Amino acid sequence: HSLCTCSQLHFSEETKQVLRLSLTEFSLPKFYLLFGISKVKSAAVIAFRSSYRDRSFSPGSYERETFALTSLETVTEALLEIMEACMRDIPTCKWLDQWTELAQRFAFQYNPSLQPRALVVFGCISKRVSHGQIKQIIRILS
Amino acid sequence: SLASKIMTFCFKVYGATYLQKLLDPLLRIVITSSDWQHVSFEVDPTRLEPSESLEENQRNLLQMTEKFFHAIISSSSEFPPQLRSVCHCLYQATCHSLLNKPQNSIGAVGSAMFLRFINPAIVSPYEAGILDKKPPPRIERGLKLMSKILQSIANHVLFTKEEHMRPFNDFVKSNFDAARRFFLDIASDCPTSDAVNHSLSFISDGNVLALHRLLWNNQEKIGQYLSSNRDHKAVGRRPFDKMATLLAYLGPPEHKPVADTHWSSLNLTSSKFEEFMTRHQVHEKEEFKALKTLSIFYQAGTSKAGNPIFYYVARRFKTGQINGDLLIYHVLLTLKPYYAKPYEIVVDLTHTGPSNRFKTDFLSKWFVVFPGFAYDNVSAVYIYNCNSWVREYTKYHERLLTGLKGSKRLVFIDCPGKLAEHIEHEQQKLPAATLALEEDLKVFHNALKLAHKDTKVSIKVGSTAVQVTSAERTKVLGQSVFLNDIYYASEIEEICLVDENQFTLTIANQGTPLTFMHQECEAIVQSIIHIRTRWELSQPDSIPQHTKIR
Amino acid sequence: RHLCEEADIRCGVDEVSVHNLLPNYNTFMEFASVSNMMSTGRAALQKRVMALLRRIEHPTAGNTEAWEDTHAKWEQATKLILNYPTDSLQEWINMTGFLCALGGVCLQADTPVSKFMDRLLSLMVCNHEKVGLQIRTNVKDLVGLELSPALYPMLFNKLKNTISKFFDSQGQVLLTDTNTQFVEQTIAIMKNLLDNHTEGSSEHLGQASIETMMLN
Known part of the structure; x- marks a missing residue:
């Protein structure tokens, strides 16, 4: 939403249609399931609590759904669609080159909590791969 | 079935005009011409009348059939483009059907089209609405036998165990080749109409609303059908993904508007409507009688040619306050005795407003309710005291009124000095309220309407109302005319004189006020204040007002 | 089938005779498909039979005489059940369902079809101590879910007139135990x-x- 209503950037009327359609998709029951908040009628209500000054939050229902690396692809490729649309207008943009470096750093470092997610993202956005990188990927599988 | 209903709509919507235009002239000759006089088109020996010679009946029936048969073949060009495409698809379907399987694809198409489209009109023209009055049974018999002979030609089948009609078998032999040419011409349309092009690209606003409503109702089920198939490629760029996204974006459809008219369906014609109203007891409803008092579409003397004149007052009809069918019956009832002969109709659109208007659906019915031949008997149409609002309405409803675009029968009174010459003075009975104005007050010639565009307008400050007459011609339905807006004095709620160069005239529910420039604005505003003040005395209680916020 | 296939042999060309000698040719073909189905109780089967019996568009000598001939039996059968102060009823139910689904063919003042309705409407309020309840429970079930769409214009007119006389002069309701039982049925139908x-x-x-029925 902030992208659609920013004055520093000047997006042509073609691009802004892409952004406004993406805004509608993310509120569909399809994407509520990907983010893991299915069975919630509205996201806003759960995010905020009215009596947040009087009492502290009381979390419960420790039962926690699982996450599947196939869901992360759908999210990781929806966001990549938005970013590229903007880069067409903004000349000599560096957004995609900065994101790739950040992902490429966690992909090849041992961390059992971030490495799986930082690999599904390195491949979904990267535009070039070399033999030296493939050797590492096949040796993380070994 | 669904496929069947597609044909019915296609033929009925476009075929009606083609059949009536062609068949109508032929029906006049047999029905009315003294030359035909009285003759029996019967060849049945059991029913054969000794008084009339069998040969005379047989030859006359054969001669009559030739007249109709020749007309059908000749009018190849008049075939609508829509049906031409419809025939080609069937031809390709049969041709493709033949390939996988001496049957002629054209033969099957020709017999089908003739049997379901041309044949029904000939057998019973009265039901189709071609003829107002049911043909006499003796004339009806000839049409029935005529259809059978014509149908045999398409199938190239001789008379077997049909000795009654066997003598006629000779005639069909010559015309077998002729029938083939007519079918081939329509069937010869290119599979892709690269050459035949008509980029009308009409908005069709009314249709779109129904489409959006239909999709919303079946949102869930239509999605499941797409989900089952299309696994080969992700549906993200395929209908199911787009449908959910777009449909959610638009939001729920708006509620449908109400229908003043009785329930109606595709199966509607002039004959059908007349019977329905007759069975209904509209005479004693006490709402039909009120129309007589309103004096709507009343006969008034005659014209230069001597044809009777009628005057329809736009003011007298409210958009929804009364059922629209009762007005139709009154107009049809009054025109029924005389509409056969040429007639002139004059429509009074003085002080037209959105309150008195015709909706898209209700407007269309007028084209069909009447028998159809009366439209050709429209000697002339005169429009008086038109205003800008009408022009805007015409642009939106151009599609329905495209037939009247550039119509010779439409006569526009550009200035008062023209109608008085053409119409019989001392007989025209234009509205008394209209006559009350009399356009007999001061004219501020060469006043300029300051706006996005400047148009010279002559303003008359009438005794009871203000008339703004444009001095620049406008194009309405392809005929030039000068717009003459009329604003009642009572409707002039606000009168502000911003400056001596121009004054402000705000009117109820008109958004931005009306500003004009004249060398003496205070003279104009002075009179308007005097005119407005006079009304205040006339009204019993002006103080009670407002209490309404838009 | 054997009545249909005889049509083809007599005249090979379909349109000329197969739809003229046997006007209801297309519907008859559907009867065959249902027969090739698993056997089920009479209730389940009657649903399919009454569906197909409702699609007989064209009046014919066979139809117009099967409907009238079975009507006379229906009338006399009813009197025995009522006048006398389970298999007998099961037959009575079947005749009504059949005699309703196939009403449209015989359509077209006093007429056999009209006289059927009058007796039918005078059974919705049938108060019979012995078996009265079962009659009303079923006449409501049939006239509602099974009547032929070609008899709606006649059902409303008789149903409306029956109501119109519930109000006396000057529009005052006439409360009655039966009249209150009749409206309770007209709502479910x-x-x-x-x-x-x-x-x-x-x-x-x-x-x-x-309209006028709802307001009253």
């Missing part, structure tokens, strides 16, 4: 009748005016 969406029903609802 109309609800089911309107609820069901079937082919051809829409075109026929238009002819009649349901």
Whole structure:
């Protein structure tokens, strides 16, 4: 939403249609399931609590759904669609080159909590791969 | 079935005009011409009348059939483009059907089209609405036998165990080749109409609303059908993904508007409507009688040619306050005795407003309710005291009124000095309220309407109302005319004189006020204040007002 | 089938005779498919039979005499059940369902079809100590979910007139135990009748005016 209503950037009327359609998709029951908040009628209500000054939050229902690396692809490729649309207008943009470096750093470092997610993202956005990188990927599988 | 209903709509919507235009002239000759006089088109020996010679009946029936048969073949060009495409698809379907399987694809198409489209009109023209009055049974018999002979030609089948009609078998032999040419011409349309092009690209606003409503109702089920198939490629760029996204974006459809008219369906014609109203007891409803008092579409003397004149007052009809069918019956009832002969109709659109208007659906019915031949008997149409609002309405409803675009029968009174010459003075009975104005007050010639565009307008400050007459011609339905807006004095709620160069005239529910420039604005505003003040005395209680916020 | 296939042999060309000698040729073909189905109780089967019996569009000598001939048996059978102060009823139910689904063919003042309705409406309020309840429980079930869409314009007119006389002069309601039982039935019939969406029903609802009945 902030992208659609920013004055520093000047997006042509073609691009802004892409952004406004993406805004509608993310509120569909399809994407509520990907983010893991299915069975919630509205996201806003759960995010905020009215009596947040009087009492502290009381979390419960420790039962926690699982996450599947196939869901992360759908999210990781929806966001990549938005970013590229903007880069067409903004000349000599560096957004995609900065994101790739950040992902490429966690992909090849041992961390059992971030490495799986930082690999599904390195491949979904990267535009070039070399033999030296493939050797590492096949040796993380070994 | 669904496929069947597609044909019915296609033929009925476009075929009606083609059949009536062609068949109508032929029906006049047999029905009315003294030359035909009285003759029996019967060849049945059991029913054969000794008084009339069998040969005379047989030859006359054969001669009559030739007249109709020749007309059908000749009018190849008049075939609508829509049906031409419809025939080609069937031809390709049969041709493709033949390939996988001496049957002629054209033969099957020709017999089908003739049997379901041309044949029904000939057998019973009265039901189709071609003829107002049911043909006499003796004339009806000839049409029935005529259809059978014509149908045999398409199938190239001789008379077997049909000795009654066997003598006629000779005639069909010559015309077998002729029938083939007519079918081939329509069937010869290119599979892709690269050459035949008509980029009308009409908005069709009314249709779109129904489409959006239909999709919303079946949102869930239509999605499941797409989900089952299309696994080969992700549906993200395929209908199911787009449908959910777009449909959610638009939001729920708006509620449908109400229908003043009785329930109606595709199966509607002039004959059908007349019977329905007759069975209904509209005479004693006490709402039909009120129309007589309103004096709507009343006969008034005659014209230069001597044809009777009628005057329809736009003011007298409210958009929804009364059922629209009762007005139709009154107009049809009054025109029924005389509409056969040429007639002139004059429509009074003085002080037209959105309150008195015709909706898209209700407007269309007028084209069909009447028998159809009366439209050709429209000697002339005169429009008086038109205003800008009408022009805007015409642009939106151009599609329905495209037939009247550039119509010779439409006569526009550009200035008062023209109608008085053409119409019989001392007989025209234009509205008394209209006559009350009399356009007999001061004219501020060469006043300029300051706006996005400047148009010279002559303003008359009438005794009871203000008339703004444009001095620049406008194009309405392809005929030039000068717009003459009329604003009642009572409707002039606000009168502000911003400056001596121009004054402000705000009117109820008109958004931005009306500003004009004249060398003496205070003279104009002075009179308007005097005119407005006079009304205040006339009204019993002006103080009670407002209490309404838009 | 054997009645249909005889049509083809007599005249090979379909349109000329197969749809003229045997006007209801297309519907007859459907009867065969249902027969090739698993056997089930009479209730389940009667649903399919009454569906096909409702699609007989064209009047014919066979139809117009099967409907009238079975009507006379229906009338006399009813008197025995009522006048006398389970298998007998089961037959009575079947005749009514059949005699309703196939009403449209015999359509077209006093007439056999009209006289059927009058007796039918005078059974919705049938108070019979012995078996009265079962009669009303079933006449409501049939007239609602099974009547032929070609008889709606006639059902409303008789149902409306029956109501119109519940009000005396000067529009004062006449409370009665039976009249209150009749309206309770007219509500259940109309609800089911309107609820069901079937082919051809829409075109026929238009002819009649349901307003004056609802207001009363």
